[PDB]
Design a protein around this ligand. Structure first.
Ligand SMILES: O=C(O)CCCOc1ccccc1-c1cc(-c2ccccc2)n(-c2ccc(Br)cc2)n1
Ligand SMILES: O=S([O-])[O-]
Ligand SMILES: O=S([O-])[O-]
Length: 132
């Protein structure tokens, strides 16, 4: 179901992450470092619990969730959000809600690569991850 997403992934391409971060109000100094960061994403399962790690020199995050069950999340840019991750047309769809705002983080496997699409307001960022 989710098994195609599991493993270790490395960022190989990023389009419009600055625009996405600006839309969320991230400060120019964090955007500057984020533009040169190439995270490792690790996705693991233990029964119905997923754990998604994002590792880099300058920043690390870790979340654990059950698909379709809301969880509290503190994002890399320090937003306290209400999150839900669901399997939708074989995509992992992560919806974050806070202060009446919404962003989606969609993960889709295309040609063996994990495509992460980030949407907030009108901003759309596409990050390509490749298997380690
Ligand atoms: O997984 C992805 O490729 C992006 C997921 C959506 O991430 C963000 C969404 C909105 C605002 C900021 C970010 C973000 C993510 C990271 C990050 C990078 C590596 C490891 C962990 C986190 N950001 C970051 C990088 C460096 C510094 Br200093 C501070 C933050 N910013
Ligand atoms: O662990 S790699 O196959 O994503
Ligand atoms: O562009 S390199 O980081 O894949």
């Amino acid at each position: 179901m989710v098994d195609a997403f599991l493993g270790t992934w490395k960022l190989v391409d990023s389009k419009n992450f600055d625009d996405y971060m600006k839309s969320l109000g991230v400060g120019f100094a964090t955007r500057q470092v984020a533009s040169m960061t190439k995270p490792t994403t690790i996705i693991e399962k233990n029964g119905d619990i997923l754990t998604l790690k994002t590792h880099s020199t300058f920043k690390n995050t870790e979340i654990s969730f059950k698909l379709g069950v809301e969880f509290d999340e503190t994002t890399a840019d320090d937003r306290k959000v209400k999150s839900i991750v669901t399997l939708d047309g074989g995509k992992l769809v992560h919806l974050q809600k806070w202060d009446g705002q919404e962003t989606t983080l969609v993960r889709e496997l295309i040609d063996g690569k994990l495509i992460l699409t980030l949407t907030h307001g009108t901003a759309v960022c596409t990050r390509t991850y490749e298997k380690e």
